Each structure stands twice: as structure tokens, then as C-alpha cells.
Design a protein around this ligand. Structure first.
Ligand SMILES: *[C@@H]1O[C@H](CO)[C@@H](O[C@@H]2O[C@H](CO)[C@@H](O)[C@H](O)[C@H]2NC(C)=O)[C@H](O)[C@H]1NC(C)=O
Ligand SMILES: *[C@@H]1O[C@H](CO)[C@@H](O[C@@H]2O[C@H](CO)[C@@H](O)[C@H](O)[C@H]2NC(C)=O)[C@H](O)[C@H]1NC(C)=O
Ligand SMILES: *[C@@H]1O[C@H](CO[C@@H]2O[C@@H](C)[C@@H](O)[C@@H](O)[C@@H]2O)[C@@H](O)[C@H](O)[C@H]1NC(C)=O
Lengths: 137, 124
């Protein structure tokens, strides 16, 4: 089962088959707990729709901003959507050697970015490109 | 000279509140309204640089500027259309604006960021 939804964008429609769309941002998955001095674990998610319920590909670039306004792209990520199944992570690539501290890492299971609030850089963000596929692509 | 609220920054004809809490642009807008304020309306580069020098500055902060679907144009929450301050971005990647470091960037409205509220003078 898959119920078509599009909440990762509030002012733009999803692309038509077979067009693409650029998405920039990140969700704070554990928002309710995190918005309540101590260093805490924040979990971030790319702007990726779990119930897109259409054959599509997601291709994103993950980055942070340093204390000297420099953007560090620490990794690449990919997801696929199907008309019959929810969105699944299909791959992660990390910049080697790791350009950041141990205070941020990407989870392998999901593509979730785990960060400690004591980090000497900004919250992670994803430059995602959503490409919806034509019928029988 | 108007008395500015407790733990609020003061600069020219404005009072500023920087949130420590992250949320969507709409939730950020609601929060400023509950405080009897509005999201940040940047007057000039001098106002911008004041905030940068007194803000943790590497993170993104929602401002009172978005791509309104009724007008089909970038507009400040005060109803004034946006002109060239420049919004940076190679592509159209969102309908909501935020101060990113020193630059003004477009981002997805459903994203989670901190925000700057403002209380401005409008007479006696
Ligand atoms: C979306 O992609 C799926 C593949 O994941 C397509 O399903 C295939 O459909 C053909 C018939 O058209 C079957 O012969 C295959 O067995 C199906 N593949 C799988 C793996 O289930 C589906 O047709 C695509 N949907 C659209 C609208 O094009
Ligand atoms: C709505 O907000 C905008 C942005 O803060 C105001 O625009 C400024 O207007 C002054 C003149 O009053 C100009 O000198 C500035 O350069 C403008 N700044 C920008 C960035 O546009 C505008 O005044 C406000 N409109 C109303 C009706 O109050
Ligand atoms: C940043 O924090 C790292 C781990 O944080 C830990 O988790 C929180 C929730 C608390 O339980 C805290 O006591 C833990 O330390 C540290 O390993 C690391 O040294 C810290 N980094 C800096 C730069 O201070």
C-alpha cells in the first residue's frame, strides 16, 4: 500500500512525468524533543517524500557551513520511489578523508544525518534533485 | 525613544528577537505573531550587518520574505514587493527566504530553521 502525498514542498507541485525539481533544506526529525545548555543529539532528514507513490529518483548533496562562511559538502545520497512502495534509500557516499569532526555522521539504514548540538559548524542541509519518471521508463 | 522588551536587541527604529528553536517558515511566522511582532523585514545592509555581528551566525534564520502564490512574486510579509539586496541561488529550490551566514538564500518552506522576529515603530 502507498497513498500519494507531497509535503516536502508546500508552495510548489511535484514534477510531471518526466521532469525534475530542485529542493533545498532539511527537517529536524526529533524537533519536539530538541526544541525543549546540555549538548543534545539532533537528527536531520533530507527533503525526501516517504509516500511520493510514483516512480522517481532523488539525488542529493549534503553540506554544512563553517564558522568562516565556507560550505563543506560532506556527502552524496540517492533514493528511489515506486508507485507501489514507500521511498527507499539506494546509496550514500562520504567525502574521504572525513572533512568534519565526529560530532556529525550519516546513518547507513536511513539516510538520516545525526549531529551533536556542540558542533563547530551549522545544521546539515540537502540540495536534492527530484526527477519523476515517465510511464514505463 | 521607545522602551524595547526584555532580552530583545535594539537597533534604530526596531526591536529584535533571535529564536533558539528551529521550525518551518509558517510556524516561525505564527511564533512572531504570538509575541506581537513580525518576521524580520531587512531595511538595509547596515541592519543586516548589525545582526550578523551580534548573532551562531553560520546557521540559517527565517526572514519575513517568501514567494507568495497569490501574487506569483517574492514579497515581504508587509506587502512590499522584493527588489535588488539579492536572493542567492543557482536554481529555484524553495519559496521561503532566510539569512544564510551573510547572504540571503531561498530554501524550502517545510525546512526547519531558527528565525528573527522584529517590533518596529509606526507612530504615537
Ligand atoms: C513503476 O515501476 C515499476 C517497476 O518497479 C513498474 O512495474 C512493472 O510493470 C510491468 C508491466 O508494465 C511488469 O511486467 C513488471 O513486473 C513490473 N515490475 C516490478 C518490479 O514490479 C511500473 O509499471 C511502473 N509504473 C509506471 C506508472 O510506469
Ligand atoms: C516593507 O519592508 C521593506 C523591507 O524591509 C521596506 O523596504 C525598504 O524601504 C526603504 C524606504 O522606506 C528603502 O530605503 C529600503 O531600501 C527598502 N529595503 C528593502 C530591502 O526593500 C519597506 O519600506 C516596507 N514597506 C512598508 C509599506 O512599510
Ligand atoms: C561534543 O559531544 C560529544 C558527545 O556528546 C555526548 O552526548 C550528550 C547527549 C551528553 O551525554 C554528553 O555528556 C556526551 O559527551 C563529545 O564526545 C565531544 O567531546 C564534544 N565535542 C566538543 C567539541 O565539545
Amino acid at each position: 500500500s502507498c497513498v500519494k502525498k507531497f509535503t516536502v514542498s508546500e508552495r510548489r507541485p511535484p514534477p510531471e512525468p518526466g521532469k525534475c525539481m530542485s529542493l533545498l533544506g532539511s527537517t529536524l526529525v526529533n524537533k519536539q524533543a530538541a526544541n525543549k545548555p546540555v549538548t543534545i543529539l539532533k537528527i536531520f532528514r533530507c527533503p525526501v517524500e516517504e509516500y511520493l507513490c510514483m516512480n522517481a529518483t532523488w539525488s542529493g548533496r549534503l553540506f554544512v557551513r563553517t564558522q568562516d562562511n565556507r560550505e563543506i559538502i560532506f556527502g552524496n545520497i540517492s533514493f528511489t520511489s515506486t508507485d507501489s512502495s514507500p521511498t527507499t534509500l539506494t546509496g550514500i557516499s562520504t567525502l574521504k578523508p572525513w572533512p568534519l569532526s565526529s560530532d556529525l555522521w550519516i546513518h547507513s539504514g536511513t539516510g538520516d544525518i545525526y549531529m551533536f548540538s556542540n558542533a563547530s559548524f551549522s545544521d546539515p542541509k540537502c540540495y536534492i534533485t527530484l526527477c519523476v519518471l515517465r510511464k514505463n521508463a | 525613544k521607545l522602551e524595547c522588551p526584555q532580552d530583545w536587541l535594539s537597533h534604530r527604529d526596531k526591536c529584535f528577537h533571535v529564536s533558539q528553536v528551529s521550525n518551518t517558515w509558517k510556524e516561525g511566522r505564527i511564533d512572531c505573531d504570538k509575541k506581537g511582532a513580525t518576521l524580520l523585514l531587512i531595511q538595509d545592509q547596515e541592519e543586516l550587518r548589525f545582526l550578523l555581528d551580534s548573532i551562531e551566525k553560520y546557521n540559517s534564520f527565517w526572514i519575513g520574505l517568501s514567494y507568495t502564490l497569490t501574487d506569483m512574486n517574492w514579497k515581504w510579509i508587509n506587502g512590499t514587493a522584493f527588489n535588488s539586496l539579492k536572493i542567492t541561488g543557482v536554481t529555484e529550490n524553495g519559496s521561503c527566504a532566510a539569512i544564510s551566514g551573510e547572504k540571503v538564500t531561498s530554501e524550502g518552506c517545510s525546512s526547519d530553521n531558527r528565525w528573527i522576529c522584529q517590533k518596529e515603530l509606526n507612530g504615537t
